């Protein structure tokens, strides 16, 4: 049930990490993409392609037309109705944004003949190989104690963190410490809530994949 809250936080932070490059931000993902304008902008920033010109009209049919420019573009890149987005359907909006994250942050990742989600997982497993207290098997329970994230940072930037000093006792601090370092030194905004991750039996993998993908791109 806490999945919506986790996706809202993380997907909003991810969107904002890109929209800032176009001079704007969103705040409330359940309403701020209704008119399609910032959704089109997001797609342009992350794809590097131009979309058709937006319609700044205020009525429903103007919004449908903008949202279609976005959905039709997405459909051209990936192997839902505009009304769902224009009507502020929360589940469908989060689903649409996951589609975008998966396509533009994750799909093109390729490591050892392994692509997309599976490729990002293999990369994480390769980079955390040296750490005996880490066992990445998935994008949920494997990341709960914060050591995985800390290890990703240490593997590339041992100047930024003393990994030996860490252990499983303080998962909340482990997660926050990684996020603080990433924000301060890797230009990666904080996209998770440490409390939610630790206190949920199975954290939301879409949220975790989103954040972890930012580390992949920072270090590539």
Author numbering: 34 to 112, 117 to 257
Kindly provide excerpts from the paper associated with this entry:
α-Actinin-2 (ACTN2) is the only muscle isoform of α-actinin expressed in cardiac muscle. All four isoforms of α-actinin consist of an N-terminal actin binding domain (ABD) comprising two calponin homology (CH) domains, connected via a flexible linker, which allows for conformational flexibility in the ABDs, to a rod domain. Thus ACTN2 is important in cross-linking actin and titin filaments in the Z-disc. We have investigated the effects of two mutations identified from HCM patients, A119T and G111V, on the secondary and tertiary structure of a purified actin binding domain (ABD) of ACTN2 by circular dichroism and X-ray crystallography, and show small but distinct changes for both mutations.
The original family reported to have an association of the A119T mutation with HCM, had a variable phenotype, with some patients only developing heart failure at the age of 75, and others showing heart failure at ages 36–44. The ABD was in the ‘closed’ conformation in all the structures, as found for other structures of the ABDs for the second striated muscle isoform ACTN3, and the two non-muscle isoforms ACTN1. However, although continuous densities are observed for the loop region at residues 110–120 in both the WT and the A119T mutant structure, this region is disordered for G111V mutant between residues 112 and 117. For both the WT and A119T mutant structure, Val112 is orientated towards the interior of the molecule packing the side chain into a hydrophobic region. G111V lies just outside one of the three stretches of amino acid residues thought to mediate actin binding (residues 41–50, 116–140 and 145–165, reviewed in) and A119T lies within one of these stretches. A119T is within the binding region itself, and its alterations to the structure may be expected to have a small effect on binding. The A119T mutation has an intermediate effect with Tm (60.8°C) only slightly less than WT. The Kd was increased ∼2-fold for the A119T mutant, and ∼1.2-fold for the G111V mutant constructs compared with the WT ABD.
